[PDB]
């Protein structure tokens, strides 16, 4: 009937607009895309902000899943659209259409991985939990091995919590701070005023964003073949293009 869809507040994928009520309080590339896919489909939606405000992972001693991908495998959504990477981890529990989005770990500063791992002065770290945290600590490749060994031991706190706090902490460091983060967030802060942070070097890996669904749900198939076709009309495109540089204001 109502399909029930779970996100999280992350701009500019979803954002509250800055009167209304159910899905017109919500704006945002995300907000798009999944009025773009229920056309598609052919279904009628309910968007629901994820109550622990996660994206998905799977308690090491309780071994239950948090966040959007908890909601989807304990059945309490039927479709979770939002900027929640693909991983291993997370597809042997849930599926994901082919990405709306492509993305890679990168580097944003007021070069290479591999220089600021073999530097000392300017300090660097990733969110306190999330893929690219756990790209870090779970990587078998050298040179972040070196970044990782060094960010979980360095003091004070290399952390952030949120994508504000690693901005914010890059914008007051004065070139001492380099934050490590997903490059579509990177391109995104770049148009945002003081217009005042970079991205530097190629990407770290390479993944993308997915819509997903439980594990043999039905809506599965037509949500792949509806991204499949947003992408090749160019909509999917032109979607990150108003939210990014349309919607620049650098
Ligand atoms: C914004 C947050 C916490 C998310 C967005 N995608 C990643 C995820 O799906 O884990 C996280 C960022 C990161 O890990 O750098």
């Known amino acids: 009937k109502t399909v029930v869809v779970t996100t999280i507040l992350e701009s500019p994928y979803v954002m509250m607009k800055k009167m209304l009520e159910g899905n ?19 279904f009628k939606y309910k968007l629901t902000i994820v109550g622990d405000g996660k994206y998905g992972a799977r308690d090491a001693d309780t071994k239950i899943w948090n966040g959007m991908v908890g909601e989807l495998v304990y059945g309490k959504a039927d479709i979770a659209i939002a900027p929640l990477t693909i ?25 290479s991985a ?40 360095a003091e004070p706190s290399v952390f952030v919590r949120t994508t504000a706090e690693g901005v914010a902490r890059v914008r007051k460091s004065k070139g001492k701070y380099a934050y490590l983060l997903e490059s579509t967030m990177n391109e995104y802060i770049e148009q945002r005023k003081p217009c ?42 032109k ?6 540089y349309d919607k620049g204001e650098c």
């Not at 017109?24 to 052919?42: F, N, S, W």
């Not at 599926?95 to 070069?111: A, Q, R, V």
């Not at 669904?213 to 198939?221: F, Y």
């Open 239 to 244: 979607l990150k293009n108003k939210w990014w």
């Open 196 to 237: 005042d942070t970079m991205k530097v070097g190629g990407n770290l890996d390479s993944k993308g964003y997915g819509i997903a669904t439980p594990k043999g749900s039905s809506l599965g198939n037509a949500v792949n073949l509806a991204v499949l076709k947003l992408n090749e009309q160019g909509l999917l495109d």
């Open 24 to 42: 017109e309080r919500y704006e945002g590339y995300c907000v798009d895309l999944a009025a773009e896919i229920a056309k598609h489909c052919g």
């Open 114 to 153: 591999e220089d600021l791992s073999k530097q000392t002065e300017i300090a660097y770290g990733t969110l306190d939990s999330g893929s690219t945290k756990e790209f870090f600590r779970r990587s078998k490749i050298a040179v972040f091995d070196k970044m990782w060994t060094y960010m979980r031991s």
């Open 87 to 111: 991983t291993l981890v997370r597809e042997e529990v849930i599926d994901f259409s082919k990405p709306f989005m492509s993305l890679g770990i990168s580097i944003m500063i007021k070069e």
